[PDB]
Enzyme design. Structure first.
Site, short mmCIF file in Angstrom:
data_model
loop_
_atom_site.label_atom_id
_atom_site.label_comp_id
_atom_site.label_asym_id
_atom_site.label_seq_id
_atom_site.Cartn_x
_atom_site.Cartn_y
_atom_site.Cartn_z
NE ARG A 110 -23.72 -8.07 -8.30
CZ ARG A 110 -23.33 -8.63 -9.47
NH1 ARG A 110 -22.62 -7.92 -10.34
NH2 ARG A 110 -23.65 -9.90 -9.72
NE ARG B 282 -23.13 -16.12 -9.08
CZ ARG B 282 -22.90 -14.97 -9.67
NH1 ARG B 282 -21.80 -14.28 -9.41
NH2 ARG B 282 -23.79 -14.52 -10.53
CG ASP C 133 -18.65 -10.82 -17.32
OD1 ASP C 133 -18.20 -10.14 -16.40
OD2 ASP C 133 -19.82 -11.17 -17.35
CE1 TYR D 117 -19.45 -10.78 -8.67
CE2 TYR D 117 -17.24 -11.43 -9.42
CZ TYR D 117 -18.61 -11.49 -9.52
OH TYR D 117 -19.17 -12.21 -10.54
CD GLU E 23 -18.38 -15.29 -9.50
OE1 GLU E 23 -19.30 -14.96 -8.77
OE2 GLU E 23 -18.10 -14.65 -10.50
#
Ligand SMILES: *[C@@H]1O[C@H](CO)[C@@H](O[C@@H]2O[C@H](CO)[C@@H](O[C@@H]3O[C@H](CO)[C@@H](O)[C@H](O[C@H]4O[C@H](CO)[C@@H](O)[C@H](O)[C@@H]4O[C@H]4O[C@H](CO)[C@@H](O)[C@H](O)[C@@H]4O[C@H]4O[C@H](CO)[C@@H](O)[C@H](O)[C@@H]4O)[C@@H]3O)[C@H](O)[C@H]2NC(C)=O)[C@H](O)[C@H]1NC(C)=O
Ligand SMILES: *[C@@H]1O[C@H](CO)[C@@H](O[C@@H]2O[C@H](CO)[C@@H](O[C@@H]3O[C@H](CO)[C@@H](O)[C@H](O[C@H]4O[C@H](CO)[C@@H](O)[C@H](O)[C@@H]4O[C@H]4O[C@H](CO)[C@@H](O)[C@H](O)[C@@H]4O[C@H]4O[C@H](CO)[C@@H](O)[C@H](O)[C@@H]4O)[C@@H]3O)[C@H](O)[C@H]2NC(C)=O)[C@H](O)[C@H]1NC(C)=O
Ligand SMILES: *[C@@H]1O[C@H](CO)[C@@H](O[C@@H]2O[C@H](CO)[C@@H](O[C@@H]3O[C@H](CO)[C@@H](O)[C@H](O[C@H]4O[C@H](CO)[C@@H](O)[C@H](O)[C@@H]4O[C@H]4O[C@H](CO)[C@@H](O)[C@H](O)[C@@H]4O[C@H]4O[C@H](CO)[C@@H](O)[C@H](O)[C@@H]4O)[C@@H]3O)[C@H](O)[C@H]2NC(C)=O)[C@H](O)[C@H]1NC(C)=O
Ligand code: NAG
Ligand code: NAG
Ligand code: NAG
Ligand code: NAG
Ligand code: NAG
Ligand code: NAG
Ligand code: CA
Ligand code: CA
Ligand code: CA
Lengths: 107, 389, 389, 389
Positions: D291, D213, D71, D325, D198
């Site tokens: 996801r 979120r 990240d 995302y 976010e």
């Protein structure tokens, strides 16, 4: 590589006439032929490059001609002192390959 | 600028040269996507100077670079890329399609001419302002060719020298005078020049001087001087014994002003000269039989004197390195009292002397005059033919 | 320009063609990052002409080029790159996402239309000035398609021909008249034309002429002539026996002005024509069964005469080389008395005739008219399918 | 534009979505030099819309892509490249250095914020007009983070939501109100929202709405509504039983307007929503645990009704393909009566579900509303993890 071929190998002419040495390449050498002359017991001297351009101070009686794979060196008014081995050499792509020489004998 | 350019200044004193641009095309193109080119040159807009060259439609490394010894095909194009970048697939701009070109900026926009076609049905189309304006078909059916360096304009008129016909004989040379991409007038070669090929030109004080190539019998170079205002010209040869074509016979002591200097026949190399009285410099290969090395010699009055010998000189590429085509360009829109004379040398690499690889390609070195006397270095293309194996 | 364009001139005399642009996409894309494309075309802004094509989302060399024989997927996009650069990953610009497009500049900015989706739920969204303005859903649920060459505008109105429905039958063709990306009006195909596919259009003297494709029974091509001012049209076929679709039956002696010329069924190729009385030129493949070669023939009055035969001609790609889609474009913002007719040929390469590789891709050749009679050359894509193995 | 932007319109009716942009980053980056990115988004200037994302300092193919699951490192940077180009080494532009960002254009120029540093000494520096104006040090010493989508401005004021502190608990969220890159004011999170991460925001009619979120207990998303004129805000959760975080429990029948909906704990995904009465659409993954897939559902009054169920919907990525995302953006400088709602989905590829490769990277799909009801297709990243082996 380009293989230069000289034949005849021995030639004779009397004093005063012409003789014309023939040299031939294996592929189009695109007028990149040099002619050296090696006087017996001496080093080669550059006579003509690009098939006809005489070097500094080789007399006009020496004349090169040729095209494609066929080249030829002519000497006029052969002199007694013109007796020598004549080599042709390609100068179009490395390695530079020389013909086997031709001996001029004066008849 | 938004107005036509007029050649209102004269040359500046040339007392040594300084590097202007270096490519390094072939050394970078061993890992990046550089295009195979040949016949380079440089030309300036009011705005920027850019490198120009004829491309071959493949990158050095791709398998299609095999065979680029060949001069003309339908995959050649005249491209442009920023001064001292290599001619990359990604930053190049095609000015036209063809295998012989000339291009110049008249002050408002630019003229680019590409010639194309079979050797017996070639065409030239003249692009003015990135649009095709006029085209000219062949007139002697045997490889219509043109400059391979920039043309020069004066008040909108840009003379361009074309040759069509044999390279081993009489050919048909004509001077065309374009303006805004249209043909104002044209004329046949007039003067004592016997054959014309690949003229390199510059202009000062309202006169355009071209130094060209006699491919059929010269070792000294034809000069064409053009009057862009009356649209007339004359041609002669450089009088100097410092012979500058290549291949060449050994330099004599007296040259020949009105005739070819005799010795090499049916060969040559594109070359240039700044001819300005005592301020005259000449460029030539150092080798007499090959495109290796490149020197610039000051030979005062070389144009008119048949005994002119060098008085100062400068080595640009060592004789142990390859050179090639050379030509002239000037930044006409540079500020200042006079014009700074510049030139470029094409550094050919590949076939046929370095036949271990199957491409022929090249890079660029360009220099411009200074009035200082500057120290000299030499400027090798630089790549090792052995890393491409 | 900052004002709408009005088609105020007529064509220029077409007496031969000269090369305008050449890509060399596939030969360069063997070593550089060129994108796989297909369905190319060219279109001009007031400012620049750019090459346009449908991309496939992979470069020729990457492993994802396997399978690009396929026409439509969700990785296709309409891209743009400078005239005669290859369509590179790094210099291309996406105009929209979709698998069929048309794009044109109205004088102020440009319209680009991409169509997308499943074959039964396709959509067209009309981008005006790089922003999405209007969208149109499918009307006959079977692959809504459109031009694959540029649209043409007159005073802000830009007619665009769409077809939705079978390619092997009756389909639903409509002419839409957009202005500033909004729908002014639309109408169904009216005329004697039986089926419409992939129209190639140009405009002069306030009338837009499209030459299209009859995929269901024609070997002669439908012509649609549109009046952008009254927003009406008529359709007919080219009367000439010089049949120009491909595949085609052998050219007859009398053609058919109001009907499909019978012979090949359920196939075709996109193609163009400049139809202007005696000044009429037609393009066609040289082969009757395949996309190989490409010639341009002067057939005066071909549109109206059912006995029109060629009187002059020009070979653009030899029959021993591959051709493909062709279409028309003109630089409407070029200065001068008339319009210079131009066209492009798509040079397809890869699957299925050259199946040794797994991609299908193509390159571009474009030509523009001259009034000179210029010598002809031919213009091969140029790559060797054997260096990609 | 040369004047500050004011959010003077309301949304347009959302009746289906049309594709706006598609990357194809990973399929092209198998052969070209694409950079490994993650956390994408899109943002528009008055002039152009550009794709934005956090880069990782290596190309997909280079050996340094090993480990990009991580990240934050000091080789991440916020870059920008043209709409629908892949993020190439050669066409990208770095807006700042850091591992979390937000960026937006106030009408005159743009604000970009990058956050950087160790997790206990992170800094944010706010760039205004490509120059660093203000910086903010950490306030709770635990990974100061921010939006990962564009901020929105109204008359020069651009609220930006930052969180610093645990992701598994209470953290310190503050709303900052910048103008010309300077801090006008800031405030703590106020409302019934328990944790903020976010936020994805858009503005209409002088009010900015962010959907965020809850990483600590929510499966329904916190909404922050900001008044850029009075510089105050409130926070609540989406009332709807259509739960939209991921992972999530199975959708209930009655939701929770003022509290986290209970079920998954300490996890989440960035996501967005257009909340406008009956005109409300919500985005969510199709999968509840992963996801994969992405659908947009019309759930009228979802914000306020705890029984809101979908009434129309649209599938954007199939559940058999990966998503990631998502966030909102709008072209505020698009002409017309209302604002066209747009969004993007990040399509993550690589580690950890596709661990056969050692990189994690992603591509982009973006859609924008239409009032037509358009047919739907789905939009896969598209690469085969097997060609990178
Ligand atoms: C710091 O930098 C400065 C500036 O560069 C250096 O000073 C310069 O140094 C140069 C080299 O010494 C010097 O150039 C020479 O200038 C003289 C004038 O006095 C000029 O004649 C020289 O040119 C001849 O010689 C060169 C090689 O030296 C040849 O390549 C050239 O072709 C010239 O010779 C040939 O042509 C002449 C004319 O026909 C003939 O007379 C001569 O015989 C010769 O002919 C043969 O060769 C030809 C091919 O090579 C062939 O075609 C022909 O048939 C014959 O076979 C040379 O230019 C600069 O003038 C000098 N400049 C300044 C400002 O001082 C300095 O060295 C550097 N300092 C340090 C410490 O490194
Ligand atoms: C320098 O460049 C100039 C300029 O380019 C050159 O001059 C040009 O040279 C061209 C080639 O000679 C010449 O083109 C020909 O012009 C005639 C008019 O007199 C025209 O009829 C020719 O077109 C037919 O022939 C070509 C091949 O030659 C075919 O490919 C073409 O399709 C035409 O034939 C077919 O269609 C006709 C109409 O139906 C039929 O009558 C004919 O039978 C034939 O039908 C079959 O073939 C079709 C497919 O190929 C098939 O569908 C059908 O069913 C049948 O099977 C051709 O265009 C230029 O006019 C001329 N231009 C100028 C300005 O002079 C010059 O050569 C160059 N000089 C040098 C020294 O190289
Ligand atoms: C041409 O294109 C048009 C336009 O796209 C096509 O028409 C559209 O077709 C869509 C598909 O049929 C249609 O969408 C559906 O609309 C209904 C409204 O009537 C809506 O309820 C649907 O949404 C539910 O179903 C989808 C899958 O079908 C689920 O993925 C989604 O999550 C919704 O279900 C879940 O949530 C609901 C609310 O809580 C629950 O009631 C339901 O039980 C379900 O819950 C489970 O799944 C969740 C995860 O999947 C999980 O979290 C939860 O816990 C449960 O396990 C869907 O949106 C469009 O409305 C329609 N549009 C138009 C304009 O007509 C047309 O098909 C195309 N034509 C052709 C010929 O191909
Ligand atoms: C350029 O030069 C010509 C004469 O050579 C002169 O008549 C003309 O007015 C000049 N124009 C400009 C803009 O210098
Ligand atoms: C190109 O190069 C190869 C070796 O790389 C050589 O054998 C071949 O003859 C050359 N010419 C062509 C057209 O391939
Ligand atoms: C364009 O043409 C229309 C008629 O076709 C005319 O009424 C209009 O005024 C023209 N405008 C321009 C800018 O040429
Ligand atoms: C792609 O090409 C390979 C060989 O390169 C072939 O075996 C395979 O079936 C092709 N199709 C796909 C989807 O891989
Ligand atoms: C923007 O909006 C504010 C109130 O929200 C108003 O006072 C200001 O004058 C507006 N300015 C512009 C240029 O629209
Ligand atoms: C990176 O990938 C290699 C294999 O490609 C793996 O063995 C190694 O542990 C990974 N991590 C690092 C820091 O190299
Ligand atoms: Ca010569
Ligand atoms: Ca047909
Ligand atoms: Ca959550």
């Amino acid at each position: 590589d380009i293989v230069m071929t000289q034949s005849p190998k021995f030639m004779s002419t009397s004093v005063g006439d012409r003789v014309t040495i023939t040299c031939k390449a294996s592929q189009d050498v695109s007028t990149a032929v040099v002619w050296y002359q090696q006087k017996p017991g001496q080093s080669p001297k550059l006579l003509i490059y690009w098939a006809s351009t005489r070097h500094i101070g080789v007399p006009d009686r020496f004349a090169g001609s040729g095209s494609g794979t066929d080249y030829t060196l002519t000497i006029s008014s052969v002199q007694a002192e013109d007796l020598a081995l004549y080599y042709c050499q390609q100068h179009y792509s490395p390695p530079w390959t020389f013909g086997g020489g031709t001996k001029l004998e004066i008849k | 600028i938004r107005d036509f350019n007029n050649l209102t200044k004269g040359l500046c004193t040339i007392n040594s040269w300084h590097i202007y641009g270096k490519d390094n095309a072939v050394r970078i193109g061993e890992d990046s996507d550089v295009l195979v080119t040949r016949e380079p040159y440089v030309s300036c807009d009011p705005d920027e100077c850019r490198f120009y060259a004829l491309s071959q439609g493949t990158t050095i490394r791709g398998k299609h670079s095999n065979g680029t010894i060949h001069d003309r095909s339908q995959y050649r194009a005249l491209i442009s890329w920023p001064l001292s970048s290599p001619p990359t697939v990604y930053n190049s701009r095609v000015e036209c399609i063809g295998w012989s070109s000339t291009s110049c900026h008249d002050g408002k926009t630019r003229m680019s001419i590409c010639i194309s076609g079979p050797n017996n049905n070639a065409s030239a189309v003249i692009w003015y302002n990135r649009r095709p304006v006029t085209e000219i078909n062949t007139w002697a059916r045997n490889i219509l060719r043109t400059q391979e360096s920039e043309c020069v304009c004066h008040n909108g008129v840009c003379p361009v020298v074309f040759t069509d016909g044999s390279a081993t004989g009489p050919a048909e040379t004509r001077i065309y005078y374009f303006k805004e991409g249209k043909i104002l007038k044209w004329e046949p070669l007039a003067g004592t020049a016997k054959h014309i090929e690949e003229c390199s030109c510059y202009g000062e004080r309202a006169e355009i001087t071209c130094t060209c190539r006699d491919n059929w019998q010269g070792s000294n170079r034809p000069v064409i001087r053009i009057d862009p205002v009356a649209m007339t010209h004359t041609s002669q040869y450089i009088c100097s014994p410092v012979l500058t074509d290549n291949p060449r016979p050994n330099d004599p002591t007296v040259g020949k002003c009105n005739d070819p200097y005799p010795g090499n026949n049916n060969n040559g190399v594109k070359g240039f000269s700044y001819l300005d009285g005592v301020n005259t410099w000449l460029g030539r290969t150092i080798s007499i039989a090959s495109r290796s090395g490149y020197e610039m010699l000051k030979v005062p009055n070389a144009l008119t004197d048949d005994k002119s010998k060098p008085t100062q000189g400068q080595t640009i590429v060592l004789n142990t390195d390859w050179s090639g085509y050379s030509g002239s360009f000037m930044d006409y829109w540079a500020e200042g009292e006079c014009y700074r004379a510049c030139f470029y040398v094409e550094l050919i690499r590949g076939r046929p002397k370095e036949d271990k690889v199957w491409w022929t390609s090249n890079s660029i070195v360009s220099m411009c005059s200074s009035t200082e006397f500057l120290g000299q270095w030499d400027w090798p293309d630089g790549a090792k033919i052995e890393y491409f194996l």
